[PDB]
Amino acid sequence: TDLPRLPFDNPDIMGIAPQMLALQKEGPIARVGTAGEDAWLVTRYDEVRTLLADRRLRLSNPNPQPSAKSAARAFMVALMAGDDHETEPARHAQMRSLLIPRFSTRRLRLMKTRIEHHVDELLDQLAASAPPVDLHRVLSFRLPTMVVCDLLGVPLADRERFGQWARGTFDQSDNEHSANTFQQVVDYMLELVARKRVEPGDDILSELIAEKDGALSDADIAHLGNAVLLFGYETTIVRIDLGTLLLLRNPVQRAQLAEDPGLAPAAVEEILRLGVGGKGSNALIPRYAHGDITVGETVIRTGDAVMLAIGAANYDDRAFPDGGLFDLTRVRPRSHLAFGHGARHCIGRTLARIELTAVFERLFRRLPDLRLAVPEESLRWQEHRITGGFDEIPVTF
Ligand code: HEM
Ligand SMILES: CC1(C)C[C@H]2C=C(C(=O)O)[C@@H]3COC(=O)[C@]4(CO4)[C@]23C1
């Protein structure tokens, strides 16, 4: 008897930690220690998907004496309207109501066209440069920040100002750096709201300003803008890096995709399913039980913390035959859980899929000899950031 402790070690740079797969083989739910509170860890696909749809399991903490959280985690929860359990129902409902129509089919069609040209230009610059090159800096970072500049209606050079703010805000290791970065985000966004009130354009804050005959306060509008900026590029960057590494590891699949770029949507879905880095602490969705819930023979009690392991569930053999294998020829694969499920299902997921499809339609057709310029084992997943990620990806081509 040894209580497992999150985070678990992973001897590889990607995939699921061996002890989490061990727990998944035993059963769907286990009690575990963490760096803070103990929690229920749910690792099988069926059970994670069912609990993500359970309205008794919520982001907010209902406990009278809530455990302490890092400044980074507190900011994340507040941007998601989860910081007060008594107001979460109304505030979270309004959050989704106001954000979902900012990603209409009209906007996404226009953005797809611009995204495709931008990737073409990014890869032309990459192809003309002399290796070794940092693929993370000149491709993975540049496309999603271009997209956020478009959503916010700001010059592309602004991403040189805000491009590290998601990392800094979500630095769990330094509460002072986290709070100081978040203040820069707030200042920038309040500046942008004030500008869009006199100079609106085809962009998200202009639409929120116009909403309901101007019923929203500037602080309400900026709060929504901060969520778009802080959630809307960094995780996509990480998926471009992980998708590149996964395809480099699977040359038969990579050659299939180079030959037929019509396989890109299927490759993107496999990349999202399998793309988990380092110890994979970002591939857990955190919840608290607001009422008792039974999972198998296990009772989750009101107030208990729950970690829904979307990464491990996406590797679950019960849901994906040979769940550890990258296979873009899967016939009717189950819907993966990398965007979540249920009440908080990712708002940007259709846009994120457009970006990743445009990249992997083009990458290995444009750079057929692309490969790492350093060993995989030298690539360092950044465990202290809520969103993880690699800091650099050196390549040759
Ligand atoms: C591949 C890239 C992305 C991944 C893997 C991802 C993943 C996720 C996941 C798993 C959640 C659920 C969190 C939870 O249930 O607690 C979520 C929520 C969210 N995502 Fe995404 N996301 C991505 C890109 C984006 C983009 C591009 C945007 C906007 C431009 C965005 C905006 C949001 C927002 C606002 C939420 C909060 C939803 C809510 O709390 O109701 N995300 N994302
Ligand atoms: C809003 C989020 C940025 C989306 C989700 C994906 C993430 C990631 O891929 O890094 C974030 C990690 O931390 C979380 O609690 C998550 C899993 O819900 C995320 C919060």
Swiss-Prot record:
Protein's organism: Streptomyces arenae
Cofactor(s) demanded: heme
Residues annotated for heme binding in this entry: 346
Residues in the signal sequence: none
Family stated for the protein in its record: Belongs to the cytochrome P450 family.
E.C. number: 1.14.19.8
Protein name: Pentalenolactone synthase
Alphabetically ordered keywords of this record: Antibiotic biosynthesis, Heme, Iron, Metal-binding, Monooxygenase, Oxidoreductase
PROSITE patterns assigned to the protein according to its UniProt record, in alphabetical order: CYTOCHROME_P450
Protein's pathway: Antibiotic biosynthesis; pentalenolactone biosynthesis
Domain of life where this protein originates: Bacteria
Reactions catalysed according to its record: pentalenolactone F + 2 reduced [2Fe-2S]-[ferredoxin] + O2 + 2 H(+) = pentalenolactone + 2 oxidized [2Fe-2S]-[ferredoxin] + 2 H2O
SUPFAM superfamilies to which the protein is assigned, alphabetical: Cytochrome P450 (SSF48264)
CDD domains: Cyp158A-like (cd11031)
GO-annotated molecular function: heme binding; iron ion binding; monooxygenase activity; oxidoreductase activity, acting on paired donors, with incorporation or reduction of molecular oxygen; oxidoreductase activity, acting on the CH-CH group of donors, iron-sulfur protein as acceptor
Gene Ontology terms describing biological process: antibiotic biosynthetic process; pentalenolactone biosynthetic process
Annotated transmembrane regions: none
Reported phenotype of the disruption mutant: Accumulation of the precursor pentalenolactone F and lack of production of pentalenolactone.
Function: Catalyzes the final step in the biosynthesis of the sesquiterpenoid antibiotic pentalenolactone by mediating the oxidative rearrangement of pentalenolactone F to pentalenolactone.
InterPro entries xrefs: Cyt_P450, Cyt_P450_B, Cyt_P450_CS, Cyt_P450_sf, PentlenlactSyn
